[PDB]
Amino acid sequence: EEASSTGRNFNVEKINGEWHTIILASDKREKIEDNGNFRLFLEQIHVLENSLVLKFHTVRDEECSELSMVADKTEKAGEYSVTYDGFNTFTIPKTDYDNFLMAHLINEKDGETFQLMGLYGREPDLSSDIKERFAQLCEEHGILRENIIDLSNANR
Ligand SMILES: CC[C@H](C)c1nccs1
């Protein structure tokens, strides 16, 4: 079964648990490159009543560092917000709960905005068909292939 956080049939409780960053894409490529502060490796999502606890790690020359954030529900169904290097709001355009999850985020800081989309998996890698389906969604949002980074061999 596939759902959108924006849909009426979305069951947030089902995204609880372990996840992995598989692919990241952005409007502004430098934010997800090597020393980018948005190059985050998701490890777990803990679902709360009106919030989402997010646990990640960042990596610098293979050294990993823990990072946690709490995203709160906004007034729009299926949308959360979190303050991190500016103000961010995000939704989950597509997920099947037990395999993949696609996220869409908009960052705003000092009159400037950029978008970030990510593909996460319950396992550290996903099939090529799902990866290509993600590339197609990125295209719909105006993000081209040169700005999509597959991190499946850098996510552990
Ligand atoms: C679900 C993961 C989303 C896209 C986030 N990345 C940075 C802050 S929230």
UniProtKB/Swiss-Prot annotation:
Cell compartment(s), UniProt: Secreted
Family annotation (InterPro entries): Calycin, Lipocalin, Lipocalin_CS, Lipocln_cytosolic_FA-bd_dom, Maj_urinary
Gene Ontology terms for molecular function: insulin receptor activity; odorant binding; pheromone binding; small molecule binding
Pfam families assigned to the protein according to its UniProt record, in alphabetical order: Lipocalin
SUPFAM superfamilies from the UniProt entry: Lipocalins
Gene Ontology cellular-component terms listed: cytosol; extracellular space; nucleus
A GO biological-process term: positive regulation of glucose metabolic process
Tissue specificity of this protein: Abundant in the urine of adult male mice but absent from that of females.
UniProt keyword terms in alphabetical order: Allergen, Disulfide bond, Pheromone-binding, Secreted, Signal, Transport
Primary location class: secreted
UniProt family annotation: Belongs to the calycin superfamily. Lipocalin family.
PANTHER family linked to this entry: LIPOCALIN (PTHR11430), MAJOR URINARY PROTEIN 1-RELATED (PTHR11430:SF76)
The protein's role, per its UniProt record: Binds pheromones that are released from drying urine of males. These pheromones affect the sexual behavior of females.
Miscellaneous field: There are about 15 group 1 MUP genes and their transcripts make up about 5% of male mouse liver RNA.
UniProt-recorded name of the protein: Major urinary protein 6
Species annotation: Mus musculus (Mouse)
Organism ancestry: Eukaryota, Metazoa, Chordata, Craniata, Vertebrata
